[PDB]
Structure formats: structure tokens, C-alpha cells
């Protein structure tokens, strides 16, 4: 029903990881881009706002889904992308080659027939420098989950009717709940957490013949024995931090490196992680992918590092090398990072002023470097190159290829064309921002979002929102209580308007 | 290609838990009993020696271990039991019936065709009362197992020794990491690591296992008209350490086997030891306190203090004795009575106790006035203990205590000591049990005829030419007082050893 855009699927992303491998990928706003099952097109759609000039095709076996995305198509007039009711073997050479082919959780749960199929156009129907994108659920991690679902499947088979054997199945769930909530063994925490997980989702993937479908349950060697069949070559995962050595002894270390497979490596470190699942990038055999990454590769991305400094930066003096500034990663109290380092805590505070915005690397030496009364900057540069791809290979920096965007003018707020057409015509309470991903808002915030088209100013939109209060059509809540005070609700839409600008300039909602 | 005895496949422990749930199961002694997958019959020949009035037979496919155990039962001169190289699917009718049937470690490892036969015979050749043994892997608990023979495999690709440094650098790349899933994959590979040579085939690793749920495993039973009795390991049954309203639920539903299931997907059940019966055979599932006077008893207990230096009566005293009997699991009791029992139980170890010896021996340490608390005691305790797997139950017979002057051991143990070059013997209860080269010489002599000093006189002549090399503290012998003094120092905690592992006649 909901189709959600997946920012690990971006095609700048699937990019970027290609230039860090040493390929040069086709440009994401010329390219032609496939989806495999695409659903709706909640994946698709947004890339085809961004870019008049690439071509977009998707995919999908459901009538439903496909009205719907040809649906939202129409609804903003975009003619750059179409969408095919059919099932992916009936692809062909005339469909053409690709850029790039996002497959998103499919190739697990169709038959052998149609993940040769996938394998044989994510090799045939793709570009010479094209990626290809594949994600499926992996061996040992995924026999958990096998389990809880023979385990509901074998409760549930006593009645006939689906209504009740849902639940039935969450009356299982929570029996699992019960029986172990004393229990000391990890076993127990583990099923524990998985039969939590299990009971959150809705009665979609809790049908019994959802459950009783089939999982190809491959190992990362099996699945590479199969793209290997086609031609197709590993070229990472895309979350880059799976790919990470040297948590482990440097013994082990060592042994890992001697061996040259990447393949045989991966398939260990499943092994010993527990992996349930991989986002796989594929590409030609035929390209030479270069996995010596030195410390000044950084220089050839641009770089986003998403902190929240503890003490702002007007309350502390950076020149200070005995002081401890901490600052909070994606959130937070469980994680963060501390330096007393004048360097590194200068270009901290400029990735945190910048959040979600790419900054190219001179870009951050020399704001950092402004910070420092200009003088430090070739220990800012070096700083950077000594700390900056250790944490990339970790997953706490995020490097692209997206260019840096211009700071937004905040006085009459700009949202996207994506956004303004979710926040109107859509019931969705989340919007899709411009680094493809979804950002839940409230019906304060989705209000707003209809309103920014670079010509209403604060006192505009405010107005606006508080003609949707009159018809209510909205309501506000400064306690659990709510104010229906003339004077007070005015009030509190300005107390909620800063935060909210704030909010939208850090998740990339703003033009 | 080592044949063991397994002792939770005794059909005397088939014949009590099946008189536990209230089947009156075949006489032992006088029985048939069958084995499927016995070569070398190292867990069928005991039996035989132990009851020369019951029929046993034999069936396996290796060809060199039949012969091995023919060759032990012309040795032991055994005119009851015949083995067969043959397999599972050229038995017969014509083999008839039989009161026990053995199926250990097979099951998993045979093909659907095979499995179909062992589910046959296990109703076609049982008795009316008969009891079937079958034991499966089972599902989710070995998703483990299977995923490090994977590994193993997946590695290979001399075939031992990788295996071994990939165990190895499994520990060592996970040298710590807190997550749960490192400790229990560290220690699956330490304990499979641990296991030497014979499982690592890597013929066997690329074996293929049935991969049962126990659901699966009792719908090919029903198919065949078998229901389930019980489980060999008792306490794996036992419920509550689970929350009350858990046991209401389970036990709203009637259904033992998914039940079972059902505490198999949350305990992750790898293994189960299964009691099938003959479907027309009502089963009592019924347990009373007092059903324990049905058994003999055996408690393994060795107390912290000794009985001449406590007071029973000392009611502010609180008395701990160990289980294992090492240290870890214990059980501590303030009760005169409790006491009693408990001391009874240290003295009598691994010798089956009635209900009126138990009591009535307690009692005597109590000047005889306290019969009726202590048989109080006991009543309200021991079932509870024994569906915990604390204590045992046995429909065997209490034993003679064994006289000392000139120690004895069984037929089969000093066959074993004498002529065997295993390192272990198989006491009375069916146990394997480990042996250094000094107490094995000093099982060879052990008959109703050599005293310590002709038993110690005749280990000498081993040392002597020896092929037996003592150490003390260590690699010490000095051709005299290095010995013969440090055999005395040996000798007496060795006769205890053989006295309560059941060694002794």
C-alpha cells in the first residue's frame, strides 16, 4: 500500500560508491534508470522530479500499484518516465540498456526462473559503466526470522479463514512475549527482540500466505556464484561500514588480507556477524575496480558529517587544546564523539552548521579554517585527511558526488515540487526530501510544507495554517490540553514556526 | 569408528518412564530387543552379558564394525545376541517382534525411503507394550550447527586440519565482541572444536540432515500409528520455570506435541531422545507426588560437610551438598529430615534406593523416632526433583553393597580392561566411564580373588615392564619409593571411585 522512496537506493549514491571503487558512473541527470518491482513508484517518481533530462522505466506484477504510479505521474505532468504492468521476464533488448537497475528486496522471494531473469538483464539491459542494485536476505541471519515464521505458520494452521489466523499470529507473538519475560539466556533476547519486531508490522506481511512464501535464503557466495554466471562483478555493499576490517585483531586482519577474494572474505564476515541481509552493487566483469582507498581519495567527494555540538559554538573557544567539546551523531546520547583538538573541532562545528548539505573539501578546510583567525589551515587539511576516510569506511561520513546546494533564503521558505505535491495532494504523513529520503511530519509541519513556494513570507504562511485552524482541519496542543485562545493560537504558531524552519534547513526540505 | 554405550538408551530407563506415564513395559531380563545403526555394538553387547535370558540383535551397515562385534561376542562367549550387516530396509516381519527397539543418531542422516523403513519397523516389529527409542536433530537449534558445517565446507573449498585453524580464527577474529551472537558462535566452535576427527569427515559435513520439527517428526510417526510417551531426558518436558499464566495456557490446550513444539521454537531445541509407543496403549499423563514409590531412587549428592561432624538437629545450621558434584549446582537445606535424606542418598551413590530404604536408612540417623517426617519429606520433594532431572528414577533393582577385601568388577569391565585399548569401561548403568592406565591394569585384576596388596602386586609387574608409568608431581618414578607408596595413594580413592560409579559387584 505505502510505497516509500529508499535513499540507498539513490542512484547518486550508487554513484558515488562507483567513483570511490575507481569507475566512472554515467551522470545520474542524463542516465536511463530501471526498477525492478517498483511499486507505486514512491523509489522512482522523486528521481524523475529532479531530473527532466534522465529517463526513468519501472516494473511491477501489480495492476494496483502500476494505476497508482501512472496515477502520480499524471498529477505532476511528468513526461520523462513510465511505468509497465508485467512481470520481469517479459523484458527485453528493446527495452534498451540502463544506467542504472535497482532491484529492492524482489530477488529473494521470486522464483529461480525470474532471479536468472534479473541476473540476465541486470547484465544484458545494463550500461558498460552502469550499476547494478540488488538487495536480498542472507544466510546465517536470516533463520530467525524462517523460524518465527514457521512458528506462527504452524500455530495458525489449526483455522482455515486468513482473517483470524493474523491473529491467532499476534496472540503467538505476545505468548512469546510473556513466556520469556524472565529469562537469562541470549536466546531468549534474541527471539525476544525479533517477535517485538515481528509484532509491530500490520497485517500485510502477517498473512499466512506471505508467510508461506519462499526465501531463496542465499549465502553472499551463492548469490555471487549465480551473478557470476551473467558476467556480473562484486562491486560493494552500500552500506559502506559492512565492508569494514579492523574492528577485529590485526592478526585476523592480516589473514583477511592475504587472501584476495572479496567474495570469500564477505562470505566470513557473514558468517561471523550473522548477517541477515545485503544490498548488493553488481557491475560489468569487464571494469577494473581499484580497492586501494588512501586517505586522500577523500578529496575527490563531497563530504556530509550530521553532528549536533553539545555547547554551541558562540559559548566555547575553540583555540582551547585542553577543553573537551562533544558532539551528537544522527541524534543523540548513544552516539557521539569528543576531541579537545582545535582542528577537528573546527571542522565539526562546520560540518554542523552545513547538516545534510554536501561540502566539498576546500569548502570545509577553509570555513574551519575561518574559525581559527585563518591561520591553521594546513593543519585543518591535514586533520581532515588523517581522520576523514577512517570515519567514511565506518559509516559516520557520508561522501557523495551530489554537488553542494546553495544556503536557503529563509525568508520566504522554498520547498521542493516533490514535497509541495506530497504535503497538498497526498494523505502520506511523510515527505520525500532531496536526498531521497522520508522525513516524517506533523500535521503542523505537512500544513506549512503546502505553502512555501518562495513567495509567502512567515507571517503569510502563518496566516494561512491559521485559517486551516478555523476549519480545524487542524488543532493545537501546548499540553496534553489543547488552546482554542484567539490570541494563543497565533501565539503558538510562531513559538512552532522557528524550530520548524530550522528542522526542514537540516533534513534537505528546503531549496 | 569408536562404538559407545549411551546410557539414555538403557531399556530399563525406556522401562521406567514408561511406567512412569503408565505402561507397563516387557520384563528386561526376559525381553527382545532390537538395535538400528548398532555396530560395533558397544551399546547392545552390555546388555547382553547383563541379562543372558533376553534375545538382542543387531543391525548396521558397516560390514568392518559387525565383524568387530562378533568378534567381541565370540570373545565374551555370549549365546543370546546376533548382529547383522544389512540395511534398515531388508527388515523383516519375519525378524518378529520386539519389546525394545534402539534408533540412536540414525534418522537425521538417512534418506526419506530409510526413515519411512525405521518408522515401519518401530510399529510393525514393536510389541503390544513395547517402546521404541528414536533420536533426531531438530529444528530451530540446529540452524547452528548446519550454518558452521557450512563454513567449514565453504572453507575447504588434510581437510581436518583447516577445519581446526578455521575453528580456531573464528575465536580469534571474534577475540571479544560483546554481541550475543559472538558468544554463542564462540562457543558452538569451541565445543565443536573440541570434538576430535570423526564428525569433521568432511564426507559428513557434506551429509544432509532430515532437519525435523518435532511436528514433522510425530506426523511420520502417527502415519505409521505411533504416538509420542515422553522424551528420554525428562526435564526437558518440564515446565514452569515459565510464568503461571503460560502453563494455564499450554496446559488449556490439548496437545502434547505441539506443546512440545511450541517449547522447542523458544528454548531452541537441537536435539531430542524420543519414547514413541503403539497407538491402541492409553497413556497417563498424571503425575503425583507419590507415584515415586513406584521407583528406585538415585540422588547424586556429595555433602560440604561430613556426617560426624554436623548436627542434624541443628535447625539455625544450613547444610549444602553438591549435585555434579562439583560446586556450581547445590542444594542447601536447614531440615533434620531433608538432611537425613540427603546423607542417605551421599552414602548410597549410584546404587538404586527404595522408598522404605531411603526413609527408613535416613531414619536411623534421626535415633529412629522420625520415620514419618522424613517419608513426609520426601514424599512432598522427590517428584517434584525428579521432573527436574535432579533425580533418578529406575525401575532397577537395588545392589549388594560390593565387599572390599577383594574388590570386584562387572564381566564386561574386565574384558574391556584387559583386552581393550579404550580408555573407558561400562559400569552397571550403562555409562561410559574414563579410566587412567593405573585404575584400567588395576580393573584387569579385580575378580573375587586378588587382595590389594595381589592387586597392587600384579600392576607392579605391569610398571615392571611397563607400559604403565606413574608420576606423582610429575613424570616422577624412581623404581621403588616413587612407587608402591604412591600406589596406596591410590589405591583407596580408587576402590571409592569404582564403588559409587557402579563399577563394583
Same mark, same amino acid.
Given at each position: 500500500?505505502?510505497?516509500?522512496?529508499?535513499?540507498?537506493?539513490?542512484?547518486?549514491?550508487?554513484?558515488?560508491?562507483?567513483?570511490?571503487?575507481?569507475?566512472?558512473?554515467?551522470?545520474?541527470?542524463?542516465?536511463?534508470?530501471?526498477?525492478?518491482?517498483?511499486?507505486?513508484?514512491?523509489?522512482?517518481?522523486?528521481?524523475?522530479?529532479?531530473?527532466?533530462?534522465?529517463?526513468?522505466?519501472?516494473?511491477?506484477?501489480?495492476?494496483?500499484?502500476?494505476?497508482?504510479?501512472?496515477?502520480?505521474?499524471?498529477?505532476?505532468?511528468?513526461?520523462?518516465?513510465?511505468?509497465?504492468?508485467?512481470?520481469?521476464?517479459?523484458?527485453?533488448?528493446?527495452?534498451?540498456?540502463?544506467?542504472?537497475?535497482?532491484?529492492?528486496?524482489?530477488?529473494?522471494?521470486?522464483?529461480?526462473?525470474?532471479?536468472?531473469?534479473?541476473?540476465?538483464?541486470?547484465?544484458?539491459?545494463?550500461?558498460?559503466?552502469?550499476?547494478?542494485?540488488?538487495?536480498?536476505?542472507?544466510?546465517?541471519?536470516?533463520?530467525?526470522?524462517?523460524?518465527?515464521?514457521?512458528?506462527?505458520?504452524?500455530?495458525?494452521?489449526?483455522?482455515?479463514?486468513?482473517?483470524?489466523?493474523?491473529?491467532?499470529?499476534?496472540?503467538?507473538?505476545?505468548?512469546?512475549?510473556?513466556?520469556?519475560?524472565?529469562?537469562?539466556?541470549?536466546?531468549?533476547?534474541?527471539?525476544?527482540?525479533?517477535?517485538?519486531?515481528?509484532?509491530?508490522?500490520?497485517?500485510?506481511?502477517?498473512?499466512?500466505?506471505?508467510?508461506?512464501?519462499?526465501?531463496?535464503?542465499?549465502?553472499?557466495?551463492?548469490?555471487?556464484?549465480?551473478?557470476?554466471?551473467?558476467?556480473?562483478?562484486?562491486?560493494?555493499?552500500?552500506?559502506?561500514?559492512?565492508?569494514?576490517?579492523?574492528?577485529?585483531?590485526?592478526?585476523?586482519?592480516?589473514?583477511? !588480507?592475504?587472501?584476495?577474494?572479496?567474495?570469500?572474505?564477505?562470505?566470513?564476515?557473514?558468517?561471523?556477524?550473522?548477517?541477515?541481509?545485503? #544490498? #548488493?552493487?553488481?557491475?560489468?566483469?569487464?571494469?577494473?575496480?581499484?580497492?586501494?582507498?588512501?586517505n586522500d581519495?577523500i578529496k575527490?567527494?563531497?563530504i556530509?558529517?550530521?553532528?549536533?555540538?553539545?555547547?554551541?559554538?558562540?559559548?566555547?573557544?575553540?583555540?582551547?587544546?585542553?577543553?573537551?567539546?562533544?558532539?551528537?551523531?544522527?541524534? &543523540?546520547?548513544?552516539?557521539?564523539?569528543?576531541?579537545?583538538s582545535?582542528y577537528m573541532?573546527a571542522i565539526?562545528?562546520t560540518?554542523?552548521?552545513?547538516?545534510?548539505?554536501?561540502?566539498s573539501f576546500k569548502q570545509v578546510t577553509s570555513e574551519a579554517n575561518?574559525?581559527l583567525?585563518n591561520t591553521k589551515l594546513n593543519e585543518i587539511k591535514n586533520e581532515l585527511l588523517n581522520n576523514a576516510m577512517?570515519?567514511?569506511?565506518?559509516?559516520?561520513?557520508?561522501?557523495?558526488?551530489?554537488?553542494?546546494?546553495?544556503?536557503?533564503?529563509?525568508?520566504?521558505?522554498?520547498? #521542493?515540487?516533490?514535497?509541495?505535491?506530497?504535503?497538498?495532494?497526498?494523505?502520506?504523513?511523510?515527505?520525500?526530501?532531496?536526498?531521497?529520503?522520508?522525513?516524517?511530519?506533523?500535521?503542523?509541519?505537512?500544513?506549512?510544507?503546502?505553502?512555501?513556494?518562495?513567495?509567502?513570507? !512567515?507571517?503569510?504562511?502563518?496566516?494561512?495554517?491559521?485559517?486551516?485552524?478555523?476549519?480545524?482541519?487542524?488543532?493545537?496542543?501546548?499540553?496534553?490540553?489543547?488552546?482554542? &485562545?484567539?490570541?494563543?493560537?497565533?501565539?503558538?504558531?510562531?513559538?512552532?514556526? #522557528?524550530?520548524?524552519?530550522?528542522?526542514?534547513?537540516? &533534513?534537505?526540505?528546503?531549496?
Amino acid at each position: 500500500y505505502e510505497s516509500y522512496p529508499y535513499a540507498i537506493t539513490n542512484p547518486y549514491h550508487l554513484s558515488t560508491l562507483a567513483t570511490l571503487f575507481g569507475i566512472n558512473a554515467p551522470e545520474v541527470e542524463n542516465s536511463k534508470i530501471l526498477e525492478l518491482g517498483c511499486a507505486a513508484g514512491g523509489n522512482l517518481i522523486p528521481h524523475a522530479v529532479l531530473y527532466p533530462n534522465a529517463h526513468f522505466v519501472g516494473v511491477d506484477l501489480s495492476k494496483v500499484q502500476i494505476d497508482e504510479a501512472n496515477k502520480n505521474v499524471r498529477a505532476l505532468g511528468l513526461k520523462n518516465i513510465e511505468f509497465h504492468h508485467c512481470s520481469i521476464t517479459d523484458i527485453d533488448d528493446s527495452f534498451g540498456k540502463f544506467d542504472y537497475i535497482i532491484c529492492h528486496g524482489v530477488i529473494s522471494w521470486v522464483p529461480k526462473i525470474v532471479r536468472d531473469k534479473i541476473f540476465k538483464v541486470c547484465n544484458r539491459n545494463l550500461s558498460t559503466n552502469g550499476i547494478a542494485y540488488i538487495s536480498y536476505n542472507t544466510l546465517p541471519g536470516w533463520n530467525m526470522v524462517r523460524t518465527i515464521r514457521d512458528m506462527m505458520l504452524y500455530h495458525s494452521s489449526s483455522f482455515t479463514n486468513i482473517r483470524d489466523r493474523i491473529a491467532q499470529s499476534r496472540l503467538l507473538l505476545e505468548f512469546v512475549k510473556d513466556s520469556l519475560e524472565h529469562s537469562k539466556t541470549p536466546y531468549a533476547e534474541v527471539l525476544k527482540t525479533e517477535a517485538g519486531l515481528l509484532a509491530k508490522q500490520t497485517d500485510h506481511y502477517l498473512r499466512h500466505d506471505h508467510l508461506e512464501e519462499e526465501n531463496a535464503q542465499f549465502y553472499f557466495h551463492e548469490f555471487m556464484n549465480e551473478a557470476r554466471k551473467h558476467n556480473l562483478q562484486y562491486l560493494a555493499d552500500c552500506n559502506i561500514s559492512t565492508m569494514y576490517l579492523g574492528n577485529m585483531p590485526p592478526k585476523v586482519v592480516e589473514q583477511l !588480507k592475504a587472501v584476495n577474494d572479496i567474495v570469500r572474505t564477505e562470505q566470513y564476515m557473514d558468517f561471523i556477524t550473522n548477517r541477515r541481509f545485503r #544490498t #548488493t552493487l553488481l557491475c560489468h566483469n569487464d571494469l577494473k575496480i581499484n580497492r586501494n582507498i588512501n586517505n586522500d581519495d577523500i578529496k575527490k567527494f563531497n563530504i556530509i558529517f550530521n553532528v549536533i555540538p553539545e555547547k554551541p559554538l558562540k559559548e566555547v573557544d575553540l583555540n582551547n587544546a585542553t577543553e573537551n567539546l562533544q558532539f551528537f551523531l544522527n541524534g &543523540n546520547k548513544e552516539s557521539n564523539l569528543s576531541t579537545t583538538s582545535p582542528y577537528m573541532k573546527a571542522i565539526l562545528y562546520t560540518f554542523s552548521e552545513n547538516l545534510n548539505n554536501p561540502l566539498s573539501f576546500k569548502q570545509v578546510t577553509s570555513e574551519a579554517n575561518t574559525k581559527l583567525n585563518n591561520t591553521k589551515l594546513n593543519e585543518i587539511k591535514n586533520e581532515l585527511l588523517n581522520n576523514a576516510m577512517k570515519l567514511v569506511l565506518q559509516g559516520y561520513i557520508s561522501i557523495t558526488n551530489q554537488k553542494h546546494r546553495s544556503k536557503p533564503v529563509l525568508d520566504k521558505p522554498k520547498t #521542493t515540487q516533490m514535497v509541495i505535491y506530497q504535503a497538498k495532494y497526498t494523505p502520506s504523513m511523510w515527505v520525500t526530501n532531496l536526498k531521497h529520503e522520508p522525513i516524517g511530519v506533523n500535521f503542523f509541519e505537512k500544513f506549512a510544507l503546502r505553502y512555501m513556494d518562495g513567495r509567502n513570507d !512567515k507571517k503569510a504562511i502563518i496566516e494561512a495554517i491559521l485559517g486551516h485552524v478555523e476549519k480545524g482541519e487542524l488543532t493545537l496542543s501546548r499540553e496534553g490540553q489543547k488552546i482554542e &485562545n484567539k490570541e494563543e493560537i497565533r501565539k503558538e504558531l510562531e513559538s512552532l514556526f #522557528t524550530p520548524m524552519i530550522e528542522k526542514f534547513c537540516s &533534513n534537505a526540505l528546503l531549496v
